Amino acid sequence: GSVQIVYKPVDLSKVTSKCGSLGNIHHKPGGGQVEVKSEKLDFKDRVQSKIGSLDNITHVPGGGNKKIETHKLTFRE
Amino acid sequence: GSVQIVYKPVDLSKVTSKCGSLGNIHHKPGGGQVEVKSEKLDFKDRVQSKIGSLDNITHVPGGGNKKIETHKLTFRE
Amino acid sequence: GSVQIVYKPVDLSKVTSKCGSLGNIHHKPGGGQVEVKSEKLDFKDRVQSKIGSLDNITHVPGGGNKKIETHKLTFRE
Amino acid sequence: GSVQIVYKPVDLSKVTSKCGSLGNIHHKPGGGQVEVKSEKLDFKDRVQSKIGSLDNITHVPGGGNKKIETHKLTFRE
Amino acid sequence: GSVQIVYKPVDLSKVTSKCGSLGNIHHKPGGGQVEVKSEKLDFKDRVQSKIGSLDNITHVPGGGNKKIETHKLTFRE
Amino acid sequence: GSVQIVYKPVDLSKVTSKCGSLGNIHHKPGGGQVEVKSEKLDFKDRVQSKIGSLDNITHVPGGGNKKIETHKLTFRE
Amino acid sequence: GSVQIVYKPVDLSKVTSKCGSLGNIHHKPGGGQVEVKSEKLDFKDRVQSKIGSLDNITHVPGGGNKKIETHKLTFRE
Amino acid sequence: GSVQIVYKPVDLSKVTSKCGSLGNIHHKPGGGQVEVKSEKLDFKDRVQSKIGSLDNITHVPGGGNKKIETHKLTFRE
Amino acid sequence: GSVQIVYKPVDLSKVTSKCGSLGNIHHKPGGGQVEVKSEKLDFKDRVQSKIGSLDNITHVPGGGNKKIETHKLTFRE
Amino acid sequence: GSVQIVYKPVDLSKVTSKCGSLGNIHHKPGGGQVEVKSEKLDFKDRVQSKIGSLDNITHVPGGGNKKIETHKLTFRE
Amino acid sequence: GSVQIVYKPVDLSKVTSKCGSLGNIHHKPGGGQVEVKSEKLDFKDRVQSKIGSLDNITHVPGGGNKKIETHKLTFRE
Amino acid sequence: GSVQIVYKPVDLSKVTSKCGSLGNIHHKPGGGQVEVKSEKLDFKDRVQSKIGSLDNITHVPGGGNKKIETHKLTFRE
Ligand SMILES: O=C(O)CN(CCN(CC(=O)O)CC(=O)O)CC(=O)O
Ligand SMILES: O=C(O)CN(CCN(CC(=O)O)CC(=O)O)CC(=O)O
Ligand SMILES: O=C(O)CN(CCN(CC(=O)O)CC(=O)O)CC(=O)O
Ligand SMILES: O=C(O)CN(CCN(CC(=O)O)CC(=O)O)CC(=O)O
Ligand SMILES: O=C(O)CN(CCN(CC(=O)O)CC(=O)O)CC(=O)O
Ligand SMILES: O=C(O)CN(CCN(CC(=O)O)CC(=O)O)CC(=O)O
């Protein structure tokens, strides 16, 4: 008993964007106070914690387009 | 008993956007106070915690289009 | 019993972006106060912690387009 | 029982971006105060900690396009 | 029982970016105060810690495009 | 039982960038104060620590494009 | 015609206060935003204006007793 | 016509205060944002203006008692 | 016509205060942002202006008692 | 017509304060941002202006008692 | 017409203060950013201006008592 | 017409202060950034200006008591 598997999807997709003029952006975070109290921290795995943070992010990409594609083929017996 | 599987979807999709003029944006966060109290933290797996945070994010992408595509083929016996 | 597996997806996708003029961006974080108290920290795995941070990030890429593609083929008996 | 596996995906994708004029960017972080208290730290694995930080990052790449591609083929018996 | 595995993906991808004029960037971090107290630190593995830091980074690459590609073939018996 | 493995991926990818004029960049870090107190430090592995640092980095590469490629073939019995 | 005026009030008053233990007071103002727009301001006299203010005052005097006494004698012809 | 005026008030008043223990006071102002716009300011007299202020005052006097006494005698013809 | 004026008030007042223990006071102002715009300022008299200020004052006097006394005698013809 | 004026007030007042132990005071101003814009400033008199200031004052006098006394005698014809 | 004026007030006042132990004071100003823009400044009188200042003052006098006394006698015809 | 004026106030006042132990004082100003722009400055009188200053003052006098006394006698015809 033979098995024949042919896997070939075809992607011609396009992600584009056109913006004429981009600017004049003002980010003015006016302070703040953060206090966090903990005592015992145990992490044992893929762990992405974040504790006690006061962050400001200005993100202005001219583009910013994002394409994510995953191809998974599993042959098991 | 032979089995024949042919897998080839075809994608010609497009994601686009046009914007003439983009700007004149004002983000003014006026402070704030955050207090969090905990004592024992145990994380053991894929864990994405976040505790005690005062964050401001200004995100102004000229584009920002997003395409996500996943192809999964599972052959099991 | 022979098995034949042919794996060849074809990608002609494009991610593009055009922006005429990009600028005039003002990021003015106005201070802040962060206090975090912990006593015992044990991490034993892939762990990406971050504790007690006051960070400001200005990210202005002219492009910023991102393409992520993963091909995984698993043949098991 | 012979097994034949042919693996050859074809990538002609392109990531591009065109920006005419990029500049006039002002990053003015206005101070801040961070205090963090801990006593016992044990890390035994791939661990990427970061504790008690006041950082400012200005990132202005003319390009900034990013392409990530992984090909994994596993043949097990 | 013979096994034949042929592995040859083909990459013609391109990552490009054009920027006419890039400049006029002002980074003015206005001070700050960081205090961190810890007593016992044990790291025994691939560990990338960072403790008690006040850093400012101005990163302005004319290009900045990044391509990451990994090919892993595992044949096990 | 003979096994034949042929491994030859083909890379014609290009990473490029063109920038006309790049300059007029001002980095003015305005001081700061950092104090860190620890008593016992034991590191026994590949360890990349960094403690108590006030650093300023101005990085302005005309190019800055980065390509990373890894080919790993493992034949085990 | 003679006039005789004798002015001598006598004050033996006392203002006192006894407090055993005074403390454990927490003032935590959680931010706020104030905007005031005016164009023409003319003040010509004893004037005690105050415009556009975000103030926090913690006043904890151990005593705080206040005595105000005014003696005015006017002889006119 | 003779006039005789005798002016001698007598003050034996006392202002006192006792406080045993005074302390454990926490003032934590959590930021804030103030913007005030004016164009023309004319002050011509005893004038005590104050415009556009974000102030925090912690006042903890052990005593704090205040006595104000004014004696005014006016003889006019 | 003779006039006789005798002016001699007598002050034996006392202002006192006793405080046993005074301390353990925490003032932590958490940042803030102040912007004030004006164009024309004319002051011509005793004028005590103050414009655009972000001030923090910690005032902890062990005493702090205040006595103000004014004696004014006016003889006019 | 003779005039006799005798001016001799008598002051035996006392201002005192006792404090046993004074200390353990923490002043931690956490940054801040102040911007003030003006164009024309004319002051012609006793004028005590102050513009665009970010000041922190820690005032801890062991005593701090204040006595102000003014004696004014005006004889006019 | 003779005039007799006798001016001799008598001051036996005392200002005192006793403090046992004074200390353990921490002043930690955490940075800040001040920008002030003006163009034309004309001062012609007793003028005490101050523009664009970021100052920190720690004032801890063991005493600090202050006595101000003014005697003014004006005889006019 | 003779005039007799006798001026002799008597001052036996005392200003004193005792402090047992004074010390353990920490002043740690954490940086800061000040920019001031002006173009035309004309001062013609007793003028005490101060422009564009980042100063830190630690003032710890063991005494610090201050007495100010002014005697002004004006005889005019
Ligand atoms: O096919 C469409 O619907 C629109 N076309 C043309 C879009 N534009 C062309 C351009 O922007 O250069 C025509 C237009 O905007 O009128 C896109 C394509 O063929 O991929
Ligand atoms: O095919 C398309 O949809 C657009 N073309 C042409 C895009 N441009 C050409 C250029 O920018 O040099 C045409 C245009 O912008 O009108 C891209 C391609 O063939 O790869
Ligand atoms: O093929 C494309 O899509 C664009 N070409 C041409 C791009 N340029 C040529 C140049 O910059 O010298 C044409 C253009 O910018 O109009 C690149 C290539 O063939 O590798
Ligand atoms: O007269 C009164 O009413 C109270 N006395 C005495 C108050 N105290 C004396 C002290 O505190 O030393 C007595 C008490 O508190 O029982 C005050 C005075 O005579 O001036
Ligand atoms: O007269 C009073 O009311 C209190 N006395 C005495 C206050 N004390 C004396 C001291 O502190 O040395 C007595 C006490 O506190 O019990 C003050 C004075 O006569 O000037
Ligand atoms: O008269 C008073 O009220 C207190 N005395 C005495 C104060 N002290 C004396 C000293 O400190 O040496 C007495 C005391 O503290 O008990 C001061 C004076 O006569 O000038």
**DSSP per residue, chain L:** --EEEEE--EE--EE--EEEEEEEEEE-----EEEEE--EEEE-SSB---EEE--EEEE--S---EEEEEEEEEE--
Output the six-digit token pair for D62: 């003319």
E40 vs D contacts (CB less than 8 Å): 39-41
What 8-state DSSP symbol labels residue D55? Answer: -
How far is it, in rounded angstroms, from Cα G9 to Cα G69?
12
Residues of chain H found within 8 Å of residue I18, distances taken between Cβ atoms: 17-19
Which ligand has an atom closest to residue G17 CA? 4
* Beta carbons of J33 and E30 less than 8 Å apart: yes
Q: Which residues of D touch C76 (CB under 8 A)?
A: 74, 76
Contact C30 J28 (CB under 8 A): no
Q: Which one of L9, L17, L24 has the shortest CB-CB distance to J62?
A: L17
J54 C-alpha vs ligand 2 centroid, how far in Å?
54
Identify the CA nearest to D4 among candidates A56, K20, A4, L32.
Answer: A4
Distance CA(A26)–CA(A24), nearest Å, equals 7
Helix (H) or strand (E) holding E67: strand E66-75
CA K35 to CA D30: how far, in whole Å?
11
Q: How many CA atoms lie within 13 A of D49 on its CB side?
A: 31
Q: Is D63 left (phi over 0), alpha (psi -120 to 50) or beta?
A: alpha
**Chain C residue with Cα closest to K33:** C30
> G26 C-alpha to center of ligand 6: Å?
38
L with H: touching (≥3 Cβ pairs within 8 Å): no
Q: Which residues from chain E sit within 8 angstroms of residue L32, using beta carbons? A: 30-31
Using the mean position of ligand 1's atoms as its centre, give its distance from the Cα of residue C17 in Å.
14
Distance CA A36, CA A52 (A): 6
Say if the Cβ atoms of E17 and C63 lie within 8 Å: yes
- The resolution, in Å, is 3.1
**Type of residue at L74:** T
User: Could you say which ligand is closest to the alpha carbon of residue H17?
Assistant: 4
* Degrees to nearest 5, angle at CA D73 with D68 and E1: 165
Contacts of B61 in chain C (CB under 8 A): 64
Query: For F64, which of E49, E63, E68 is closest by C-beta distance?
Result: E63
Distance A16 CA to ligand 1 centre (A): 11
Is residue B34 packed enough to be buried (19+ CB in 10 Å), middle (13-18) or exposed (0-12)? middle
Q: What does the alpha-carbon distance between residue I21 and residue I19 come to, in Å, rounded to a whole number? A: 6
K32 contacts on E by Cβ (under 8 Å): 30-31
Instruction: Tell me the backbone φ, ψ of residue D26, rounded to 5 degrees.
Output: -125, 120
Q: Rounded to whole angstroms, how far apart are CA atoms B67 and C12?
A: 15
d(C-alpha I38, C-alpha G52), whole Å: 13
Ligand nearest to the CA of I12: 5
- Experimental technique, in short, is cryo-EM
Contact flag D30-J33 (C-beta cutoff 8 Å) = yes
Strands (E), chain F: 3-7, 10-11, 14-15, 18-27, 33-37, 40-43, 51-53, 56-59, 66-75
For residues G24 and L42, what is the distance between their CA atoms, to the nearest angstrom?
53
Q: Quick check: H28 and J27 in contact, CB under 8 A?
A: no
Distance CA I6, CA A16 (A): 98
Chain I residues whose beta carbon lies within 8 Å of the beta carbon of residue B33: 30
The torsion of the CA quartet J26, J27, J31, J37, rounded to 10 degrees, works out to 180
> In Å, how far from its chain's centre is CA A15?
17
d(CA H66, CA I64): 9
D13 CA to centre of own chain: 21
Closest CA to I38 of J49, H71, J15, J63: J49
Strand ranges inside A9-54, DSSP E: 10-11, 14-15, 18-27, 33-37, 40-43, 51-53
Q: Is E46's CB within 8 Å of F49's CB?
A: no
Which chains form contacts with chain B, at 3 or more CB pairs under 8 Å?
A, C, G, H, I
Give the number of beta-carbon pairs within 8 Å between H and J. Answer: 11
Ligand minimally distant from the alpha carbon of residue K18: 6
- The Cα–Cα gap between F2 and F51 comes to 56
**Contacting subunits of G (3+ beta carbon pairs below 8 A):** A, B, H, I
Nearest to G18 by CA among E8, I18, L33: I18
Distance K18 CA to ligand 1 centre (A): 87
Cβ–Cβ gap C62/D23 under 8 Å: no
Min CA distance, I63 vs chain J (Å)? 5
Q: What does the block give as tokens for D25? A: 């960017």
| Contact of H44 with I43, CB cutoff 8 Å | yes
How far is residue B19's CA from residue I56's CA, in Å, rounded to a whole number? Answer: 46
CB neighbourhood size of F77 (10 A): 6
CB < 8 Å to C32, chain J: 30-31
Q: What whole-number distance in Å separates Cα of residue K56 and Cα of residue L32?
A: 11
Asked if K7's CB is within 8 angstroms of L4's CB, the reply is no
L17 with J52: Cβ contact below 8 A: no
- Residue H59, SS3? strand
Q: Name the token pair of F28.
A: 């003015």
F-chain residues near K31 (CB < 8 A): 30-32
Residues in chain K preceding a C-to-N separation beyond 2.5 angstroms (breaks): none
Bridge partners of J5? I5, K5
Alpha-carbon gap: C26 to the closest alpha carbon of chain D (Å): 5
Report the gap between the CA of D39 and the closest CA in chain E (Å): 4
Q: I32 vs A33: CB contact, 8 Å cut-off?
A: no
Task: Tell me the C-alpha distance between E73 and F70, whole Å.
Answer: 11
Nearest CB neighbour to J19, from listed H52, H62, H71: H62
Q: What is the whole-number distance in angstroms between the Cα of residue I12 and the centre of ligand 6?
A: 17
